[PDB]
Every structure is written in C-alpha cells, then in structure tokens.
Amino acid sequence: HTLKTANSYTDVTVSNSTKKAIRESNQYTDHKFHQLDNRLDKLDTRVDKGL
Amino acid sequence: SSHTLKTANSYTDVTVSNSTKKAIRESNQYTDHKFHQLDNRLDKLDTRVDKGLASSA
Amino acid sequence: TLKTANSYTDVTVSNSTKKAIRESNQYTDHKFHQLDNRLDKLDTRVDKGLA
C-alpha cells in the first residue's frame, strides 16, 4: 500500500511550505527593520548637526 | 489504497496550508515584540536629542 | 490506511512549523542585533555630546 506515495507527497509539500513561511516572515522582518533604519538615519543626522 | 492517495493528499494540502499561516503568524509576533523594544529605545533617544537641543542660553 | 498517511502528514507538518519558526526567529534576532549595535553607538555619542 502506497503510503510511500502519500509520504513522499507530504515531504515535497512540507519542504515548499517551510520555504514559504521563512521567506514571508523575513520579508516582514525586513520591513520592520527598515522602519527603524529610517528613524535611526533621521536621528543620526540630527545629532551630527546638533553637534 | 490505490486512489485514496487523493484523500491522503488532500488532507496533506489542508494541514500544510494551516501550518504555513501559523508559522508566519508566530514569527511576525516575535518580530513585533523585538521591533517594539527597539522603538521604545529610539523614543527615549529622540526625546534626549530634543532636550539636549532646545537648551541654548 | 489514509490513517497512516494522515498521521505522517501531522508529524511532518508539526516539525516543519517549528523549523520555520526557529529560522524566522533567528533572522529576526540577527536584524535586532544590527539595530542594537547602531543604537548603542548612537547612545554613547549622546552621552558624551552631552558635554
């Protein structure tokens, strides 16, 4: 009985799923990081003049 | 089984989809949490700079 | 034995969930850190430019 074919479909689907998750989380992460990059750039410029 | 690879395969698709969404929800929760600690630190540095500034005479 | 295929699915999906979370969370930490090291560098500046 083709548990093998069921199990092997699972493996393929899971591993693409994992991929997807990681990339989607990291793009959210990159977005959040850029938020904060743009604040830090605007503060760093402040300090350089307030100097 | 033969063709109830279809029922197994279709259970695989349903479960994988719910899994992908959960992993993403949890990850992004953890991101927001860490972003927030950084936000809080920038807020208080921003306030410092606004005072360490206004002071002149 | 949909049951045996289905229960291999459950075991594999649940392992891939946590894997995707582990990797996301490490990318997040990595970014955090970059940002922390920028903050500490700016903090120190302000504490001296507080001359």
Side-chain angles (χ1 to χ4, degrees), chain C residues 3-51:
Chain C
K3 273 207 205 176
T4 292
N6 276 11
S7 136
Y8 177 79
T9 283
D10 292 337
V11 124
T12 312
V13 170
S14 279
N15 283 353
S16 149
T17 306
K18 299 178 130 245
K19 172 187 151 62
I21 291 167
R22 297 164 224 302
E23 293 210 29
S24 333
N25 274 23
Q26 184 184 309
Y27 183 72
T28 283
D29 284 358
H30 170 71
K31 282 331 294 206
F32 183 77
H33 241 264
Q34 307 197 97
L35 288 162
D36 235 29
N37 266 18
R38 270 205 37 249
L39 269 183
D40 285 344
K41 262 169 223 163
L42 201 190
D43 266 16
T44 190
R45 257 178 190 191
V46 160
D47 290 311
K48 300 150 150 287
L50 201 76

Side-chain angles (χ1 to χ4, degrees), chain B residues 1 4-5 7-8 11-12 15-16 19 22-24 26-27 30-31 34-35 37-38 41-42 45 48-49 52, chain C residues 1-2 5-7 9-10 13 16-17 20-21 24-26 28-29 32 35-36 39-40 42-43 46-47 50:
Chain B
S1 65
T4 10
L5 292 134
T7 293
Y11 175 69
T12 284
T15 306
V16 160
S19 164
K22 160 176 154 66
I24 285 175
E26 290 205 27
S27 287
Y30 177 84
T31 287
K34 289 294 257 215
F35 174 101
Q37 295 165 130
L38 292 164
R41 226 185 152 196
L42 264 191
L45 204 186
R48 254 177 193 187
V49 164
Chain C
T1 224
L2 288 134
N6 276 11
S7 136
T9 283
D10 292 337
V13 170
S16 149
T17 306
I21 291 167
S24 333
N25 274 23
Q26 184 184 309
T28 283
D29 284 358
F32 183 77
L35 288 162
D36 235 29
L39 269 183
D40 285 344
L42 201 190
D43 266 16
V46 160
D47 290 311
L50 201 76

Side-chain angles (χ1 to χ4, degrees), chain A residues 4-38:
Chain A
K4 270 209 213 176
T5 293
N7 277 14
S8 158
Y9 175 69
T10 290
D11 299 335
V12 139
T13 309
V14 161
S15 149
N16 291 353
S17 153
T18 301
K19 290 227 167 233
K20 171 168 160 45
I22 296 181
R23 300 176 344 246
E24 293 213 27
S25 291
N26 295 2
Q27 170 197 324
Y28 179 88
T29 289
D30 284 349
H31 171 66
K32 308 276 312 155
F33 174 93
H34 226 257
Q35 266 174 123
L36 290 163
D37 227 21
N38 276 15

